[PDB]
Structure 1
Amino acid sequence: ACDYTCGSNCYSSSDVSTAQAAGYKLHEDGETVGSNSYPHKYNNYEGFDFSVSSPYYEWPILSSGDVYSGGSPGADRVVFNENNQLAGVITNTGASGNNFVECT
């Protein structure tokens, strides 16, 4: 069973924790990777009901099981805050344009 289902992509809790640790470390260091400057500020335009506090940051979680290092991000993202608390696992898959839906 999947802990998070992002369209067709399957993630476990360990996949989420590994991607999140990698994202937070780059956030702490003031460093970014890729063309869309990951991790950046997630403004919550969709208005998701995240249990943890604002400011939020989006980072790519990959279907390959590899940590994001540049190039193509895919459609899947881990959302974390300033305290390294996970807000949610979101995806562009099944949402119009660059909008996001929550991973089930």
Structure 2
Amino acid sequence: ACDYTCGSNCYSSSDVSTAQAAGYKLHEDGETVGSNSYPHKYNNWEGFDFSVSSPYYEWPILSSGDVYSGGSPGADRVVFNENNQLAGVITHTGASGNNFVECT
């Protein structure tokens, strides 16, 4: 069973934790990776019900289980705040353009 399902992608809590930790470290270090410079700010204009406060940052979570190191980021993202709190898991999958929908 999946803890988070992003379209057809299946993620376990452990997967989320690993991705989050990588993203947060880069954030602390004032560093970014990839052509789209992740991690980057995330604006909650869609109003997802995140129980944690902003600012929020987004970092790619890969279907493969590997930690994002540049290259194609896919459609899935983990969202964390300034305090390294998990805000949620979201995806471009099933959303128009560059918009997002929440992973279930």
Q: Is this a same-fold pair by TM over 0.5?
A: yes
CA–CA distance in structure 1, aligned partners of residues 12 and 4 of structure 2: 6
Q: 1:13-60, CA deviations, whole angstroms, 9 ceiling, x for partnerless residues?
A: 000000000000000000000011100000112111100001000000
C-alpha separation between the residues in 1 aligned to 2:69 and 2:20? 13
CA separation in 2, counterparts of 1:43 and 1:5? 22
> Distance in 1 between the 2:40 and 2:60 partners?
11
CA distance in 2, matches of 1:89, 1:43: 14
Counterparts of 2:45 and 2:23, CA distance in 1? 21
- Write the distance in 2 (CA, Å) between the matches of 1:5 and 1:94: 12
Stretch deviating more after TM superposition (92-101 or 44-53): 44-53
- Which ranges in structure 2 are unaligned for 5 or more consecutive residues? none
SS of the aligned residue for 2:36 comes to coil
What is the TM-score with the length of structure 2 in the denominator? 0.99
Distance 1:46 1:75 in 2: 17
Question: Displacement, 1:95?
Answer: 0.5
Number of residues of Structure 1 aligned to a counterpart in Structure 2 = 104
Gaps of 5+ in 1: none
Aligned to 1:36: 36
Compute the TM-score of the two structures, normalised by the length of structure 1.
0.99
Query: What CA deviation, in whole Å up to 9, does each residue of 1:58-83 have, x standing for no partner?
Result: 00000010000001000000000011
- Alpha-carbon distance in structure 2 between the residues aligned to 1:45 and 1:26: 24
CA distance in 2, matches of 1:46, 1:27: 23
Percent identity among equivalent residues? 98
Q: Where has structure 1 moved over 2 Å in runs of 4 or more?
A: none
SS of alignment partner, residue 5 of structure 2: strand
Does 1:99 pair with 2:99? yes
